[PDB]
Amino acid sequence: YNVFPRTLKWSKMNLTYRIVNYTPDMTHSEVEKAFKKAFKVWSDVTPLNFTRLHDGIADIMISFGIKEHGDFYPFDGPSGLLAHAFPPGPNYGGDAHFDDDETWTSSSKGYNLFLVAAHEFGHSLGLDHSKDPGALMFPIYTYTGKSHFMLPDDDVQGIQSLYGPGDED
Ligand SMILES: NC(=O)[C@H](CCC(=O)O)NC(=O)CCc1ccc(-c2ccc(-c3ccccc3)cc2)cc1
Ligand SMILES: [Ca+2]
Ligand SMILES: [Ca+2]
Numbered sequence: 001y002n003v004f005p006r007t008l009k010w011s012k013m014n015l016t017y018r019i020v021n022y023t024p025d026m027t028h029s030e031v032e033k034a035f036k037k038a039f040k041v042w043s044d045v046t047p048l049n050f051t052r053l054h055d056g057i058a059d060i061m062i063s064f065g066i067k068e069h070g071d072f073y074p075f076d077g078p079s080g081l082l083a084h085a086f087p088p089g090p091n092y093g094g095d096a097h098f099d100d101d102e103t104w105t106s107s108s109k110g111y112n113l114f115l116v117a118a119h120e121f122g123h124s125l126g127l128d129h130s131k132d133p134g135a136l137m138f139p140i141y142t143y144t145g146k147s148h149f150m151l152p153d154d155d156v157q158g159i160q161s162l163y164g165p166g167d168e169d
C-alpha cells in the first residue's frame with residue numbers, strides 16, 4: 001500500500017459527513033446506505049468514527065456531478081473516471097465527488113456505488129493507490145459478488161499505519 005506524500009492525515013478520529021445531493025439511479029435511502037456501508041469498511045478496522053450531519057459543512061462532503069461540476073476537475077461522461085476524492089485536510093480535504101454520468105447501482109448492473117465509495121473514502125482518509133492487485137486501493141475498478149465485503153489485508157495495513165487498529169477486548 002501507499003499513503004499520500006506528506007502523510008496528510010486526520011488528527012481527529014470523530015469525523016462527520018453529509019451527502020449534499022443524490023443520483024437519480026438509486027433511491028435516497030439506497031444511496032445513504034451505500035455510503036454508510038462504505039464508511040463502516042474503514043471504521044471497523046480503526047478508531048475512526050463517521051457521523052451523518054443534518055446540515056451545514058461536514059468533514060466529508062459527498063456529492064454527485066457531471067462534466068464541469070464546480071471544481072477544476074471535470075468528469076468525462078459515461079465510463080472512464082468514476083469519482084474522485086480529496087486527501088485529508090481542511091475545507092475540501094476529505095470531500096468525495098461521484099460522476100453522475102455513470103449508472104450507479106447496489107448490484108452488478110452499472111457501477112456499484114458502495115465499492116467506488118469505499119475506494120474513494122480510502123483516499124479521503126489518506127491512502128494512495130496500492131501496487132497490490134488484490135487491494136481495494138488498486139486503481140482499477142473491480143466488482144465482487146460477496147454479501148459481506150472483506151476489506152483486503154493490504155488496505156487494513158495501510159489504514160492502520162495511519163490510525164492504528166480498532167478497539168479491544
Ligand atoms: N480514472 C481516474 O483517473 C480516476 C482517479 C480517481 C481515483 O483513482 O479515485 N479513477 C477512478 O475513477 C476509478 C476509481 C475507483 C473506484 C473503485 C475501485 C475499486 C477497486 C477494487 C475493488 C475491490 C477490491 C477487492 C475486492 C472486491 C472489489 C472495488 C473498487 C478502484 C478505483
Ligand atoms: Ca465518467
Ligand atoms: Ca472537507
Ligand SMILES: [Ca+2]
Pocket residue numbers: 023024025100101102103104
Ligand atoms: Ca446517473
Ligand SMILES: [Zn+2]
Pocket residue numbers: 065069071073084097
Ligand atoms: Zn469534483
Ligand SMILES: [Zn+2]
Pocket residue numbers: 119123129139
Ligand atoms: Zn483511486
